[PDB]
Symmetry: C4
Subunit: 331 residues, 4 copies
């Protein structure tokens, strides 16, 4: 074995991230303005725009959820607050029309009660929200939710970064599988634990387990540009979950901050000290202020549409079949 030892499986794969690849143009009859951007969030739920906002307390509360749903995507309400308050935010969203909304739950002692209160509040999607879903406790929560409230509510499980973990969530009954262990912009899991999986490879692997069962994959974390959204979908994901790209918007929680004459908003990991209040796996940072959500989404979907034009993809289903070229450091 060229990299050392006598075990070829010790280093199991070469992991690619978004920056490692570009989409290849292909024969096209598709105009960007006419591409169909709709896609499955879950087995049963189709969104008009394949984007969801991260379940983070500097990204998604009721205001962001309402704006995301109106833009044709969805928000996932964070769970770093009391149950009654999270459920009240679900009600606030439903009050603003027939708007789709999701909400995160953990697998702790109070997670079941949280889930039931969200259900009562009329939530459409429950996201079992962990750093590592390949675990009996997480798989049991997914299964029990699906068997109990699964007729009225779609259940998302995550996060995973391997084929076997995605397969386990599929077996548990997940309606969608969320992919991303370590790629987040505010993530320090890669330096603190030395654990992760570059996101293009993680998506390709999870899709290999999920697509043959008709389970959509949500690409979560590491998306820096609108082009990354196109790459993630081309890798086989059905939607993308955004934190950093949406934390700078007016609709996100938190105040404008002014440093050196420029405007910013705070953006922090749910595993940062500030969020948990210990061995943190996230930092507390800042992102440039970007203005209204509607305008950010327009530009993000605009980029996706351009990609669909270049690749001849009339639908997201066709984009999931596009090809990549791998690029070097120079590129």
């Amino acid at each position: 074995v060229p990299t050392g030892g006598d075990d070829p499986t010790k280093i199991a794969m070469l992991g690619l991230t978004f920056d490692d690849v570009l989409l290849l143009p292909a024969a096209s009859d598709v105009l960007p303005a006419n591409a169909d951007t709709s896609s499955q969030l879950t087995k049963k739920i189709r969104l008009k725009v394949p984007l969801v906002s991260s379940a983070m307390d500097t990204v998604t509360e009721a205001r962001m959820a309402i704006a995301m749903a109106r833009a044709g995507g969805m928000g996932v309400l964070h769970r770093n607050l009391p149950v009654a308050e999270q459920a009240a935010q679900v009600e606030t969203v439903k009050r603003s029309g027939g708007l789709l909304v999701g909400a995160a739950v953990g697998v702790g002692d109070d997670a079941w009660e949280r889930a039931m209160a969200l259900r009562d509040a009329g939530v459409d999607v429950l996201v079992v929200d962990t750093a590592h879903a390949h675990n009996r406790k997480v798989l049991d929560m997914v299964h029990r939710l699906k068997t109990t409230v699964g007729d009225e509510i779609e259940v998302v499980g995550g996060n995973v970064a391997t084929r076997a973990a995605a397969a386990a969530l599929v077996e548990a009954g997940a309606d969608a599988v969320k992919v991303g262990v370590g790629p987040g912009s505010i993530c320090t899991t890669r330096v603190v634990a030395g654990v992760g999986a570059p996101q293009i490879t993680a998506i390709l692997e999870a899709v290999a387990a999920c697509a043959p069962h008709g389970v959509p994959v949500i690409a979560d974390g590491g998306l820096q540009y609108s082009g990354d959204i196109a790459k993630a979908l081309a890798a086989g994901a059905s939607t993308a979950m955004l934190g950093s790209l949406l934390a700078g918007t007016a609709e996100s929680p938190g105040e404008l901050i002014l440093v050196n004459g420029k405007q910013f908003k705070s953006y922090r990991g749910m595993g940062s000290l500030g969020a948990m209040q210990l061995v943190p796996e996230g930092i507390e940072g800042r992102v440039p202020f970007r203005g209204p959500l509607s305008t950010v989404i327009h530009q993000l979907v605009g980029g996706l549409r351009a990609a669909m034009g270049y690749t001849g993809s009339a639908t997201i289903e066709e984009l999931q079949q596009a090809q990549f070229v791998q690029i070097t450091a120079a590129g």
Copy 2:
């Protein structure tokens, strides 16, 4: 598959750019001063210097076209202006002697009328000027131009980045194929759409489709140094189209700009907000002022001549057979 999934074709190639390769020296009887730098722009047109200026409104109007032709290359007049004005610029060039000149046309509703007005004005080369030529509308424009005015005018089609797209333009009747999707210095297609193809690989692939039909390939975009010109031709291109390298010259449109005691000129993508006036695929930037075009071309051709010396290439046709070494990040 080591990079993920079960499909070996998902990541179809490893794409190299100019910085990924160097030309290998070979046995040489060629002195730089005596190398023959002439090359086919199209099937019928041979230039004394294998260089053309980009169809951009911060690079080529009549002044640049005249200077390029006198230097032994050619200018392609941009189309970001009314038809009558573009045609008037063609006439201005023809007024300055028997000078070759090209002009860009789109595939929009007014493109045909633009093309006919350019023809009337005495243009030598029409460039069907798009970001993605692998499209029925573009191929039809190429074909119809070639069948209508193809006896008196050479028709260039572009841009492409794959073998199949180059093949389609050849079948459509292109007299030359222009290569470059995403590599331009002012291009943001790679970050906005996540689409592109590193330029050495794009040239190698397009040449594989074009050379066996005797159709010359124009390498368009991403050339940063005179050495890149030699690499592009060695990859099989017959000419190179330059934007950034010529936007700093006296002959380009626009004014000198002074910032921090240094001189610059504005250089902007035709897909930038400022050019289109939306989801832009180019930026508005600046390049150092470089002085007279004649002098820039001298240095660029000087570098090419040196390369022909090192590789023993007496002609561009011989340079197209030179070999590369791939280098690493360290190199």
Copy 3:
């Protein structure tokens, strides 16, 4: 041979360092708080935490050794001081309870006498401390120590970076093998001699020789983050030896230094001019002040525990079987 010449063995391997790999998550029933972090330092000695402090005069004297042992690891006392003083530091550590302690010896003329004085002082571990242990003089010292005092004292040999060198130390009778030629943060061997071996590959190779003989491998040098500790153990090492990561602590020798309003401590290679007082193979630098050792170790072990959680490793022995993904420059 693609990289040149006709000898495939000239470039014998592709060497990976910590930054080249990530740990892959796997099926897990392990909570970080419940993972067992104990591991063999030597054939006979098991530590509660798999960490030892470097034998450097800006890292480990009696104070650091006491604190390391109390934290469940061990200190190795440097040998850049007279024999009587090093032995007095061993006695100082033993005075503070039944605390494990190690001490470095060279292979010079006075090394044997140093070793015997340390033995008299009650040292638990002798570390034959060289830059290159694949040498008859070093192997003889290891063997003679093991045959003379080997019943009461464990003998560590190092450093090595190849399978054959590790094999030689095993044959000589080493109770543990220390791995690292060139990777230290303060090391200039790679630029001065052009010699080294990236540390993940060096560990994989040394482990291939040491594990089948039940000899533990100590990963020494190049660890920058707590995540690197997890990677090193996953590569097959049984413990990690830390210099830079512990030189910033209160317990390390030396004074606080203030530059530009920030606090630092001096950290220098034992091959630096200042340490030797010539062709130095280390620099004299500074590291940020990090506070109490206890707190640094808590965070380092915290990261390791997280990794054990992600990988489903209940023990270090299980972590040594985890898998990697190789990442690119982009990742």
Copy 4:
């Protein structure tokens, strides 16, 4: 072909430079102080230290040549001056004892007369000094010199970067082959012409042609650290030629320069505008002042000795058999 096209030979090799590799430690009985650093400069001339100074007018005139020879290496006098003056510098060196000295000649009209005047002056080594020796004019000069004065004078030919070019110089009668097209610190051939060959691969290839004929290879250009000297010799070179590493010394031509409170000396390519006084293939730069040559050489040889210690190489001939590990960008 993964990188494009249908020709596997288009991209003929993967070129490695010094930074791409490290020397692997091996079994050693060699102490650095006792290693034998002598090596063949040419078939007949053995130096005590395997180092020669570049034929550049900011590196080697009589003072540097005298100092190099006294240090056990050799200087090659530049040829950017009238014949009588170069010959007078040869005489000045011979006046300072039985000191070896070389001198550069071109292949121009006056090169033969230059060569004869150097011969009369008592030069030991003539270096046919070009950027590309794979050329009939250069090979003829080498041959004619060798047949005319070859009994009393050793003839070096260069530069080359390929096996075939090295083979041609061997056939022409070269007593040594100098390797390096494009790697020099002050070189812009790689950006101006797009031509070059990373130096480890160039050495491996040239050695494959030269060693079986007993012709020593001189590694010329790109050496930045003393460790690079060890790498070059391990790749199979018999000596290294240094420009930048010696241009900062007291013995080099030119004055001390003070900028921002630090001392520098000018260092310029022989293909720079200033040297030629056009399309330059070198820049005019500055290097830190390093003090006396004797001290620089001590440190450089010190590093080489350390490498010989780590690799168990008692002689340079043994070092030429050492092995490498290839490293990544991270390493």
